[PDB]
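Dear colleague,

Thank you for sharing your sequence with our group. We've completed the structure prediction you requested, and as agreed, I am returning the results in plain text so they can be pasted directly into your records. Please verify that the sequence below matches your submission; if there's any discrepancy, let me know and we will rerun it promptly.
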Amino acid sequence: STGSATTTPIDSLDDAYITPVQIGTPAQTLNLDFDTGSSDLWVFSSETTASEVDGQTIYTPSKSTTAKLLSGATWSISYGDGSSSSGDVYTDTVSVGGLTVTGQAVESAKKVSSSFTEDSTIDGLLGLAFSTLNTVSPTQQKTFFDNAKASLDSPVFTADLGYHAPGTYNFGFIDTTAYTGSITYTAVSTKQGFWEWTSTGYAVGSGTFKSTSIDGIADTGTTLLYLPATVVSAYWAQVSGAKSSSSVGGYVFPCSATLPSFTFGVGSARIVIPGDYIDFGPISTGSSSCFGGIQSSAGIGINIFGDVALKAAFVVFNGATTPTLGFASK
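Please find the predicted C-alpha cells below.
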C-alpha cells in the first residue's frame, strides 16, 4: 500500500505545516502537524478542557464506532519549545492520504498548554520519530508509520515541504518526479529516538564550503534551523545590520537586508537554502527588525534541521531495518 497527502503552511511565514488526517468511523478529519521530532499522535478532543479549546477541530471518540478505550493508558508530553499536553488514549482507524491503519493509538488531550490553544489551525500532532519516544504509559504505543510499515510497498515516507506553498507527505514510495538529480543517503542513529544524522559541513552564500561534522536531527515539527553558535555567527556576519538580540531571543536583521543562501552538506552532496527561506518577518507588527530563520542551538543540546532546512530538499525517511535519511535537491 501507499499514501499521499498534501501538507499546507498554517500561515504566511511557514511557521508550521498541517496535513489532513481521517480518524474513526465515520471519518473525523483533523488537521495535524506531522512531526518527525516526536512520536505521539495526539488530538484536540471532546475530552479537552473547554477553556483550552479555541477554534480547533476536535476528535469525539464516542461518535466513532471503531474507537476503543485503551484501558489504563495515559500520556504526557513536553516539547522543546516549552509547550505540553496530556490525556488518555483510544485506539481507532486512522487514514492518511488513502493509507489506512487500524488499531492506531490516538491520544486524546485532556489538557494542552497555551501555545496549542492559541493556534487555531493545528488540531493535534502526528509523530513520525521512532516509537521508543512515545509517551503512552504503561504500554508504549507505535507511531502511524511504524504500524503501517509492513504493509507499505517500501518501508519509507518522504517529506516535500513547500516554501510559502503546499507540499506533500508520501508513504510507501518515492516519487521520482518530485526532485532533481539523485538522492544522497546518509547514516542515522536511533539512539536518542530521533532521525539523527551528521551533516558534512556548510557554506554561507557564495562562500567556500567548510568541512565539519554537524550532528543533528531532521525535524519537520521545528520551524527553524538550529546550528552551533560558531556556524550561526558566521552566517549572520554576512548580513549587514544583523545582531543577536537577547530581548528578542536570537538573531534579527534589518528587513531591508539581502540574505545570503546557506548550504549544508549531505555526504558529498549539497543542499542550498535560498536566502529568502531564512526571513521570518517582523519581530512585531510594523517593526523594521526581522527575525532570522537560522539560530543558535547552544543550550538546546542538539542541532535541529527544521523546516527552514528540510523545505529546501526532498527528504526520504527510510525505515528499513537499518534506518537512513536521503536528501535531494528539488
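Summary note from our side: The longest helix spans residues 229-236.

Kind regards,
the structure core
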